[PDB]
Ligand binder design. Structure first.
Ligand SMILES: NC(=O)c1ccc[n+]([C@@H]2O[C@H](COP(=O)([O-])OP(=O)(O)OC[C@H]3O[C@@H](n4cnc5c(N)ncnc54)[C@H](O)[C@@H]3O)[C@@H](O)[C@H]2O)c1
Ligand SMILES: NC(=O)c1ccc[n+]([C@@H]2O[C@H](COP(=O)([O-])OP(=O)(O)OC[C@H]3O[C@@H](n4cnc5c(N)ncnc54)[C@H](O)[C@@H]3O)[C@@H](O)[C@H]2O)c1
Lengths: 274, 274
């Protein structure tokens, strides 16, 4: 496959897009180092990924013939992230690819404290992404075989839709900010042959959307968010996780070898929809 | 392959990226309908593609086991383009994919007439692209199986570099304009399931660059164009045609199935280089 000899570090691998990334990278020959918080968060109004789901991701990876090192870990805990990464380097010899995918949706009409939700969103989706890159770069430079960093942004966030609650604003500002991290790190790391890109998905069928009524009530409550989620293509009112994985696969494989500094819109035309 | 049962109409197929598109689409199962001007143009200061080169593209396609209908035709000649397209529909049953690739570089310190070069550039790279979409859309709608339109933009053009000669300005304005055609047509045609995207390559090793001294003398003559061509990635001071073909293949295949309205930067980081 396209990822033979590759080793991918993936945050948020318990389910959804992260699990899709793990399974589909392994199909192309990659070994996987995955983490997930494996705990709910009080102010996030839907169930997060479980340890049991993370195990299942590993089993799905192992059905491909590849291997997965999986650990419970929070991207806010930088030292823990580094320890799991280092254990990855030990088990597999190296890590050459990083997918910073972990995130949460904080949209909630019953948000209790705006400043708190803002801080939490930023911690997970901005600082957490930065942590995920930080634990990897020294190693990628050291081993001198270049590499790939990938961050998961969001199309909906790049369309300037907020209800002005703290959680929503954290999501928008984090997801935009990380496109800057992508572009700036692409330039910074070019000379080390570390390519850096992102993906900006439109609505993707995962629990964050499919089991999160709070979200539907917030767009139902605001006139300016009435068409917040609509896409262009009739067959894709939402996309599937594999669509996102396929974009990443393109970017990190020989097919997309010259790409760095790009954020691909996996959006079913959401960006042009007017 | 990824393009089994597909039929691709390609302008500028004699050589370079167009030939790469034809050969690499055919490798994935596609039959090809290709055209090229097959003539030099007086005010373009390098040799254009020949009839012999177009024949060779067809031979390369046929070595894959697929078929190519090839004709000498100018994208400025809309009725001729339509005729060749219709003959394609005839020979192969349908055309579901269009790649508007034909173009020329009009950079030339010895430009004789600015207004003339401006007009010619626009005719070929703006109106010519519009013609290429126009000949295909009625059929794609009629046949009702959706489809793909692809236009070739340019990274260097999207970086706002001109010497203010007519030819250079035609190139910059046409290549930018066609990103608008891409986004607007993506929206327009979404309901017909016709997906519309573009590619913006950085410097690509073809005669337009490799056998065009005029170009090097124009950047050598202007202080503000000293670093006009530099990319970020050390291994890609230029890219190869297959890099562009791989990006198109992603977009038009099931892998890139939700993409519409996008312009992919096949740029080795040129867009972030500063
Ligand atoms: N689903 C969508 O519509 C959509 C659209 C655009 C972007 N996104 C983004 O895609 C990414 C993946 O989301 P998904 O759709 O797969 O949803 P998901 O909630 O099904 O998966 C995300 C996973 O990340 C984990 N996670 C959350 N916080 C964490 C933390 N602090 N540390 C470690 N792991 C953590 C969760 O437990 C869960 O397993 C997220 O960054 C999300 O913001 C999602
Ligand atoms: N080479 C680069 O660095 C570069 C960078 C960015 C974008 N582009 C674009 O990529 C496209 C392909 O160029 P290439 O690099 O393969 O160069 P090329 O010169 O090798 O190929 C272009 C082909 O288009 C044909 N052509 C020109 N005018 C035509 C017309 N009016 N009708 C029909 N055919 C015509 C030529 O005969 C030639 O065979 C062009 O649109 C160009 O503007 C090129």
């Amino acid at each position: 496959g396209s990822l033979d000899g590759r080793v991918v570090f993936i945050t948020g691998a318990a389910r959804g897009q992260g699990r899709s990334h793990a399974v589909m990278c392994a199909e192309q020959g990659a070994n996987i180092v995955g983490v997930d918080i494996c705990e709910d968060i009080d102010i996030v109004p839907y169930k997060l990924g479980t340890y049991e789901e993370l195990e299942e991701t590993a089993r799905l990876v192992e059905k491909t013939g590849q291997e997965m090192l999986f650990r419970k870990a929070d991207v806010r805990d930088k030292a823990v992230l580094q320890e799991v990464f280092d254990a990855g380097v030990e088990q597999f010899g190296h890590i050459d690819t990083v997918i910073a995918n972990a995130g949460v949706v904080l949209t909630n009409p019953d948000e209790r404290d705006a400043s708190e939700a803002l801080r939490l969103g930023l911690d997970i989706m901005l600082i957490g992404v930065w942590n995920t890159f930080q634990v990897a770069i020294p190693h990628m430079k050291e081993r001198g075989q270049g590499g790939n960093l990938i961050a998961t942004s969001s199309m909906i966030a790049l369309l300037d839709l907020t209800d002005g609650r703290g959680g929503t604003d954290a999501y928008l500002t984090s997801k935009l900010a990380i496109t800057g991290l992508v572009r700036s790190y692409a330039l910074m790391l070019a000379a080390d042959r570390i390519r850096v890109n992102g993906v900006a998905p439109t609505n993707c069928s995962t629990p964050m959307i499919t089991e999160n009524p709070a979200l539907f009530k917030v767009i139902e409550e605001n006139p300016h968010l009435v068409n917040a989620m609509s896409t262009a293509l009739p067959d894709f009112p939402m996309i599937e996780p594999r669509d996102v994985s396929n974009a990443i696969l393109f970017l990190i494989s020989d097919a997309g070898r010259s790409f760095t500094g790009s954020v691909l819109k996996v959006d079913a035309g959401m960006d042009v929809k007017r």
